[PDB]
Symmetry: C6
Amino acid sequence: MNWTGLYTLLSGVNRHSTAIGRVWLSVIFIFRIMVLVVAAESVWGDEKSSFICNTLQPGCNSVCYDQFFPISHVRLWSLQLILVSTPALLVAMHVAHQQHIEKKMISGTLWWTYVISVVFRLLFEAVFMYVFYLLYPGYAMVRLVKCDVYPCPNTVDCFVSRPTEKTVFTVFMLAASGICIILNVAEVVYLIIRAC
Amino acid sequence: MNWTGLYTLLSGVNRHSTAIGRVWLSVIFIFRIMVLVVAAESVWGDEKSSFICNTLQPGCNSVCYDQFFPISHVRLWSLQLILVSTPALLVAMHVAHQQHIEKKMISGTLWWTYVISVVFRLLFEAVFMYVFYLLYPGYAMVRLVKCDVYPCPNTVDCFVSRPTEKTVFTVFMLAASGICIILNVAEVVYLIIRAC
Amino acid sequence: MNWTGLYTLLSGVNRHSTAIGRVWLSVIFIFRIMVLVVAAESVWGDEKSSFICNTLQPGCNSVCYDQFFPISHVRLWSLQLILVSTPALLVAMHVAHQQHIEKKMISGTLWWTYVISVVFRLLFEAVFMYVFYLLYPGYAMVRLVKCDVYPCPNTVDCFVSRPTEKTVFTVFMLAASGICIILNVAEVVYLIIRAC
Amino acid sequence: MNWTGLYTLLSGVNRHSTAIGRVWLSVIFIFRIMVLVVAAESVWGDEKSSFICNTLQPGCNSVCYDQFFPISHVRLWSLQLILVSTPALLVAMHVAHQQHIEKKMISGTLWWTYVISVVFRLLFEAVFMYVFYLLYPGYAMVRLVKCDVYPCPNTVDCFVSRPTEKTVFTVFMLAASGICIILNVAEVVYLIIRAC
Amino acid sequence: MNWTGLYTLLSGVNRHSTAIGRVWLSVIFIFRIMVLVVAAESVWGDEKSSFICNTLQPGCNSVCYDQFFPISHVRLWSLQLILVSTPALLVAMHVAHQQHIEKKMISGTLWWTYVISVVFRLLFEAVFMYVFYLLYPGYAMVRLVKCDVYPCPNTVDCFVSRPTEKTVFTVFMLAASGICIILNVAEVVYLIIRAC
Amino acid sequence: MNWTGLYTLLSGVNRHSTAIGRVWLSVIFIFRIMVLVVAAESVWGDEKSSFICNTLQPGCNSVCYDQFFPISHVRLWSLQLILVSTPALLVAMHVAHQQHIEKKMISGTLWWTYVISVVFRLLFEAVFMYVFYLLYPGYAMVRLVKCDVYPCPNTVDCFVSRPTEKTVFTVFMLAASGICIILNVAEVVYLIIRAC
Ligand SMILES: CCCCCCCC/C=C\CCCCCCCC(=O)O[C@@H](COC(=O)CCCCCCCCCCCCCCC)COP(=O)([O-])OCC[N+](C)(C)C
Ligand SMILES: CCCCCCCC/C=C\CCCCCCCC(=O)O[C@@H](COC(=O)CCCCCCCCCCCCCCC)COP(=O)([O-])OCC[N+](C)(C)C
Ligand SMILES: CCCCCCCC/C=C\CCCCCCCC(=O)O[C@@H](COC(=O)CCCCCCCCCCCCCCC)COP(=O)([O-])OCC[N+](C)(C)C
Ligand SMILES: CCCCCCCC/C=C\CCCCCCCC(=O)O[C@@H](COC(=O)CCCCCCCCCCCCCCC)COP(=O)([O-])OCC[N+](C)(C)C
Ligand SMILES: CCCCCCCC/C=C\CCCCCCCC(=O)O[C@@H](COC(=O)CCCCCCCCCCCCCCC)COP(=O)([O-])OCC[N+](C)(C)C
Ligand SMILES: CCCCCCCC/C=C\CCCCCCCC(=O)O[C@@H](COC(=O)CCCCCCCCCCCCCCC)COP(=O)([O-])OCC[N+](C)(C)C
Ligand SMILES: CC(C)CCC[C@@H](C)[C@H]1CC[C@H]2[C@@H]3CC=C4C[C@@H](O)CC[C@]4(C)[C@H]3CC[C@]12C
Ligand SMILES: CC(C)CCC[C@@H](C)[C@H]1CC[C@H]2[C@@H]3CC=C4C[C@@H](O)CC[C@]4(C)[C@H]3CC[C@]12C
Ligand SMILES: CC(C)CCC[C@@H](C)[C@H]1CC[C@H]2[C@@H]3CC=C4C[C@@H](O)CC[C@]4(C)[C@H]3CC[C@]12C
Ligand SMILES: CC(C)CCC[C@@H](C)[C@H]1CC[C@H]2[C@@H]3CC=C4C[C@@H](O)CC[C@]4(C)[C@H]3CC[C@]12C
Ligand SMILES: CC(C)CCC[C@@H](C)[C@H]1CC[C@H]2[C@@H]3CC=C4C[C@@H](O)CC[C@]4(C)[C@H]3CC[C@]12C
Ligand SMILES: CC(C)CCC[C@@H](C)[C@H]1CC[C@H]2[C@@H]3CC=C4C[C@@H](O)CC[C@]4(C)[C@H]3CC[C@]12C
């Protein structure tokens, strides 16, 4: 398990990515993976069970939790990571397939494929950031949430678990996503400039 | 752990699959595996325990859960993934066995085996999609379910846990399955066209 | 991790097994392993805790569960898998030992060892299927079980958890076991025919 | 991960073990490891929590459990496995060290070391079997246990969890241990006979 | 898995780090990783559930825990470890990329990159130590905490779980962080001295 | 995964350790690791939750547990193992670094480093054994503990969970630590004798 092997695995051996997408984007991806691993089960592990309301009606806790957390932050970030990494995996499979098909018996198509992949990665990053903004306005979470949804009578007080720790990890993940967006835009601009 | 090794492992080294079954189907399979891993235990982990009814009769929770969830979505998708991956595993074992048997001492039979394997994969995809449609009509889950089954008296209100997150992951998995079906049909059509 | 290595590992390099025991039996074994892994802890994870009776006497739940589930399906299938795989492991160790002992300084004894191994595998499959039939008549599980055993007073109503999902997985595992039995019988018959 | 590598790893490359200690003892060790893995957490996972008494005094459950289960079966078998495998590990380290020390610049001492190792393995097997007999007379477990120990007033009825499944696995592990004892005795006798 | 491979992996093959950053810093990093692994889930596993207050108001436990533990020690140390290891990963990726780019067709820039990386590692260590000082003044934790925050009426007594064990592990981790800071300062000073 | 590789990894390739530190100390380390793994989560898993007192005051359980178990046995043994293994890791990194630095362009310094490492390992073993003696006098644990600490009124009866199993594992770990101390002293004496 040497450094050259890991670097080659993360690069995708596409021979078209510059330093800002082969040295920095991979590091940010590793950072996001590590943060998600260390915060997925320890922080958001008991987001459902430790979440309680101040009512006595049965079934109000579940409906309140689903009302205020349509999809938890960790699952949203996992989906974002998978969809962001999908185009890189596609490019890696494309270049491996091209090497295989030329082994049994080209630059421009690979260049266009890589550019389209970076554009799609940027698009997925922006889409997931916008979805996060829609579902959870603001970067901070509050302890008290007032919920008025059936079967809860009138408005009940539900209490979120670990709002501050979740706020800290939200800040970290949003900063990492913003850095990824900036790096992808820089990579696209650099490729366009070098093409012309 | 290089890209060529992973690509060769996913391809099955059958030397008969085109790009739409060697570069795209493997990526969709990886996507489904990753989504199932990140949603199997975090979302559907407490589908039984967090599921409560509004009655006082003992044993009504279990019978209601079994009535409304004959087999949970994650287990159904796991079975679908296993049965879809079975023909690819069979073709890989067949080609490995053929290489071994020719090493100790052919194209048409392998071509027919691959075509039959793709047909069976498409059939399994369609069968599991139809079963999902039968068991759970619609792509969305509801918070309230009215259950009238012994021993629950009359009709009781049971509350599902995380209907919206499960709806999101159901949409993702159904979209992936539809993409797999389309790719399999395209692969079969392309092979038939190239044969003639 | 190439396909040739996995195929050689699953074959046992005994140079006496045909396609129906080197390409198909290994695939069925992998299928059983995967189904057991995906159903061992998710389905049968809370078979004891979610199992409740309708009485108030302490200790009735445990005695009722032990009365109706002498050994759970997952553990029974795990024992069946281990005992079925034991003769294959023995043959692999035998052939490895033979290669080692001939390296420091034969076909008929290996052929007889393989035939005896297949016979013992078939015998273990049949024995475990018969034991499953004895303990749990029928392929289906019921929600209500009437238990009359000390200390439970008179007859109490215990409620099984997820009878339908367990029925589905029981059907899958029994079908796989039947396929294994048929393949083993076919392998024995083919070897006997080729010998004569 | 080939068969020759696994066989060499399990053999210990001591060049003094016959077939009954290089092909059979390793298989029985693998069988015991697999059974212990599949029964360690699923069966004995909730031996403490599902264990309840019929009293109302606080702290009676813990003292009763410690009174009737001084050390649980799984931990006892794990300790037995570790201590039985210790002499084999010692012999493997000895032969590796001898190869290293002869590489930088003998049969009789290795033979005596192997014989002493087999004797110690047999002794550990017998000691652990005798300890199991002392702590838990009989191969079967009972649902009701009558406990009269402070602070429990008079005699209370505690209920064991899954006595029948634990009985089945006890039978399996004791049979495996007996087979190991017989094989070790046979190996010692065979080595002594071949020496003279 | 030899020692040379592990040493090369931990060094980063930057050919500019002395013994006090290639032999000692890696050992301290391994020590911190191991302590964090052995204390992450066993000690801080039930910091939320075992944490209880002496009130009867619903939702007071969660708000009190979030008030006194904005971000738990284990997550803070995990973030510190990730951010401290980020510059080393960046330097490793930089040197791998430089080797790759010179393979398809320099000392001063690598030296400056390594110096900047060590400076940033020291800065992150100091920042996280200061944050730990701000959030949790003192190295010791107390059993009683007096909390007066909505909705808890007046001042309630909350009880932390395992204050002494957490204090011991806090002392260990703070000592390791201080050693890391000292080693980084020594490395910077040594590099500056050798440059001039 | 051969035996020579594992032996080389455990030895540290320091070319100065005799048989009593290269064949026996590594085996005892493996034994301690295995015992700690098989007893860390099964025995000491529920030391906090199954621990209950005979009072009604809230928060008395946590303060009593922290009073009688300042740091649990498993965590203490894990810290002891990490600190004992630290000097061996340091020597391995030192010898790897020396090989690297001589590769790009000595016996006495390595000998002194190894001797100092063995002395420090012995010192850490003795320190941790003395700490264990201070915290938990005697090798045995008792079911009843009388606790008189705020907020518990007067003296309350707390009940430890599995005292006998924990006593057995304490005996095993203390015996292993004593064997390690004896072996380290023997190694130091042998090295001193051979030097003179
Ligand atoms: C479905 C769940 C997915 C989760 C998300 C995964 C996300 C990503 C995570 C992980 C992906 C892999 C990360 C490490 C990659 C290192 C590659 C490397 O260095 O290769 C090199 C070394 O390679 C080897 O010799 C073997 C390296 C083993 C890598 C790990 C194997 C599987 C680990 C299982 C872990 C289980 C636990 C995982 C968590 C459950 C290549 O070899 P080489 O000698 O250089 O080649 C010849 C030299 N020459 C080329 C110069 C001629
Ligand atoms: C029963 C549960 C099943 C679950 C579903 C599984 C679904 C699928 C998941 C996983 C299947 C495997 C995925 C990775 C495959 C990579 C293969 C590869 O790159 O091979 C290459 C590198 O190979 C190596 O050098 C070693 C690579 C190790 C792969 C992982 C080993 C086991 C990981 C255990 C993980 C534990 C945790 C897993 C979760 C519990 C081949 O080597 P090469 O150097 O290229 O060969 C010579 C070069 N030449 C050919 C050009 C001449
Ligand atoms: C006690 C619990 C037991 C559970 C039940 C187990 C049931 C069975 C499950 C698993 C058994 C193993 C399955 C995979 C086997 C692949 C073998 C292979 O391809 O070998 C090849 C590649 O080999 C390599 O280069 C390394 C492959 C690593 C395999 C996984 C290692 C351990 C994974 C740990 C996972 C941890 C998690 C597991 C779950 C906790 C051989 O190499 P080659 O390059 O071909 O050789 C030279 C080439 N030539 C021969 C042509 C000259
Ligand atoms: C502390 C906890 C302890 C638990 C109890 C353990 C009990 C025992 C369990 C396990 C011990 C190991 C069992 C498998 C051994 C296979 C060895 C083998 O085949 O070697 C061969 C292949 O080797 C390879 O190429 C790599 C094989 C990887 C083996 C697994 C690595 C670690 C898995 C981690 C799993 C993580 C999960 C584990 C559970 C948490 C040797 O290579 P070769 O190519 O033959 O060499 C050259 C060829 N020539 C010699 C002919 C010239
Ligand atoms: C996302 C979660 C991240 C968690 C934090 C991770 C933190 C860090 C943790 C871990 C990082 C890795 C630590 C071990 C590195 C050893 C490297 C080594 O010795 O390489 C050598 C051997 O290499 C091999 O032959 C294979 C070694 C396999 C290493 C482990 C693979 C993945 C394990 C998965 C574990 C799963 C469980 C993990 C926990 C879930 C290199 O090979 P060589 O033969 O020397 O090369 C040719 C020789 N020549 C160069 C002289 C010509
Ligand atoms: C942070 C948590 C830490 C926990 C505490 C750890 C404590 C310690 C535990 C573990 C440390 C490692 C123990 C096994 C070491 C075997 C080394 C070996 O045999 O090397 C040999 C084989 O090497 C290979 O070919 C690969 C062997 C893979 C070893 C395991 C990799 C990671 C497993 C991940 C497990 C995941 C689960 C782990 C639990 C979560 C070297 O190769 P070779 O062919 O001999 O080299 C060329 C031959 N020649 C030199 C003669 C020319
Ligand atoms: C520039 C950045 C984004 C590059 C990131 C590379 C990512 C997308 C690549 C590099 C290595 C890849 C992994 C390599 C191997 C496997 C094992 C396979 O069974 C599932 C997919 C999985 C886990 C891949 C997922 C995608 C992956 C993580
Ligand atoms: C075209 C697409 C569908 C190809 C997908 C390839 C799939 C079916 C193949 C590729 C690699 C295969 C895996 C390779 C090795 C193992 C280990 C073995 O002990 C169990 C089966 C398992 C886990 C295989 C399952 C099937 C598998 C995942
Ligand atoms: C024809 C079919 C049935 C062949 C199936 C082969 C089976 C029985 C063989 C192939 C590879 C084998 C595995 C190879 C390596 C190990 C690691 C060892 O530490 C425990 C046993 C274990 C896990 C073996 C169990 C048995 C095994 C799974
Ligand atoms: C004849 C029979 C009894 C032989 C059995 C061989 C046993 C004792 C040997 C073979 C391989 C060995 C394992 C090889 C490697 C490791 C990794 C190390 O970090 C801990 C010990 C451990 C896990 C060893 C334990 C002992 C072991 C399992
Ligand atoms: C001088 C000291 C600080 C050096 C420490 C080196 C650290 C930062 C390096 C060495 C090896 C690296 C690991 C090597 C491989 C992987 C697998 C990848 O999928 C995620 C990142 C991860 C897990 C790396 C994280 C960073 C790492 C641990
Ligand atoms: C004589 C006896 C004491 C020798 C014992 C050797 C010990 C100290 C050595 C041998 C192999 C080493 C391991 C090898 C590799 C790794 C992976 C790394 O990411 C963390 C440290 C870790 C897990 C090491 C810890 C220390 C270790 C276990």
